[PDB]
Design a protein around this ligand. Structure first.
Ligand code: NAG
Lengths: 295, 10
């Protein structure tokens, strides 16, 4: 009964289970949006238990974000492992996952768990040639992981959750170590987090998304971000490529993963957004690598 | 920046 449903998904040991709220979750909780545009504070300990860190064995580097959905399965962006134009083509043995982390650089003794990958499953139809369509990969751990106060799975959405939550005006939440900030000409100061960060962004209407990029946007993608303007606290660019985009159901109080951080736009000063893979549309793919896979 | 992780994970 792996990711074919998971009972405890999205109820966080330190918040929901103790009837405790994080310092910003009410924002997700409006229905209307106009208003609290929170900046991108540091995460609270246990605020995001499903957060994963893809780690390059050697040279030891933080490759991307990822999310815990089972005790044996991790979800990321396929571009994190396979991207011909950049000679990117990772294998099982080239990475490790790191679950249970806050600090970006410390090994976190007695908290994090580092595991090996057994197999990587890229969607057969992911499109690196043009726009990164079907940017989803699944990694099955080399051995199951024990949930902790710090380590817990997020829920995968179902038809109705996707239907009611995925909507223009509704805030979602990204978390990550800011690997979406992969500059050159930059002089990244007041940055490169020490600790995991968090920001709540509003989902954007399809046409407004299409009309801000030159990229051909498909049905498998959504965009979120505040309106390039005067006061726009919160940046998409604040996450990690392959990391999680999540909403808290107002019906059942659980946390589901609605998107995977795909690319960001005008990640500099020009008012663009973040693009994410639409988890609900790719879900039957997921449904079956799992329901029928492992090695 | 990355602190070294146990030789046991490679
Ligand atoms: C990625 O590299 C593997 C060997 O690691 C190769 O078999 C595979 O075809 C490559 N994917 C491509 C070329 O897109």
């Amino acid at each position: 009964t792996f990711g074919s449903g998971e009972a405890d998904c999205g109820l966080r040991p330190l918040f929901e289970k103790k009837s405790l709220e994080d310092k910003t979750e009410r924002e997700l909780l409006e229905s209307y949006i106009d208003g609290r545009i929170v900046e991108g504070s540091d995460a609270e300990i246990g605020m995001s238990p499903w957060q994963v860190m893809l780690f390059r064995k050697s040279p030891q580097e933080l490759l991307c974000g990822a999310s815990l959905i089972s005790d044996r399965w991790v979800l990321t962006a396929a571009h994190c492992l396979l991207y011909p134009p950049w000679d990117k083509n990772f294998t099982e043995n080239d990475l490790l996952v790191r679950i249970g982390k806050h600090s970006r650089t410390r090994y976190e003794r007695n908290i994090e768990k580092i595991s090996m990958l057994e197999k990587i499953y890229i969607h057969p139809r992911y499109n690196w040639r043009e726009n990164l369509d079907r940017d989803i990969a699944l990694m099955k751990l080399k051995k199951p992981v024990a949930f902790s106060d710090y380590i817990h799975p997020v829920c995968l959405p179902d038809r109705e959750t996707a239907a009611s939550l995925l909507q223009a005006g509704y805030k979602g939440r990204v978390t990550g170590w800011g690997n979406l900030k992969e500059t050159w000409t930059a002089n990244v100061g007041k940055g490169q987090p020490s600790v995991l960060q968090v920001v709540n962004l509003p989902i954007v209407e399809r046409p407004v998304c299409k009309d801000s990029t030159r990229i051909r946007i498909t049905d498998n993608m959504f965009c979120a971000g505040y309106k390039p303007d005067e006061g726009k606290r919160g940046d998409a660019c604040e996450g990690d490529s392959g990391g999680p985009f999540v909403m808290k159901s107002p019906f059942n109080n659980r946390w589901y993963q609605m998107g995977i951080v795909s690319w960001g736009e005008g990640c500099d000063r020009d008012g663009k957004y973040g693009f994410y893979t639409h988890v609900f549309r790719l879900k039957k793919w997921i449904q079956k690598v799992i329901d029928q896979f492992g090695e | 920046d990355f602190e070294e992780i146990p030789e046991e994970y490679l």
